[PDB]
């Protein structure tokens, strides 16, 4: 009853200000920054 722990299952946080979302599918990398998380909610949203 509480979904919480599958965001953080698929991001690739980088020291060198980057991102890789682990995504199984996925390939897009970002940057330093909350929003390639709010990305993986589109992720296992409806697609
Ligand atoms: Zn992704």
């Given at each position: 009853?509480?979904?919480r ?23 897009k ?19």
């Open positions: 009853t509480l979904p722990g599958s965001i953080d299952k698929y991001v690739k946080e980088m020291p060198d200000k980057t991102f890789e979302c682990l995504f199984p599918g996925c390939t990398t970002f940057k330093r920054r909350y929003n390639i998380r709010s990305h993986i909610q589109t992720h296992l949203e409806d697609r």
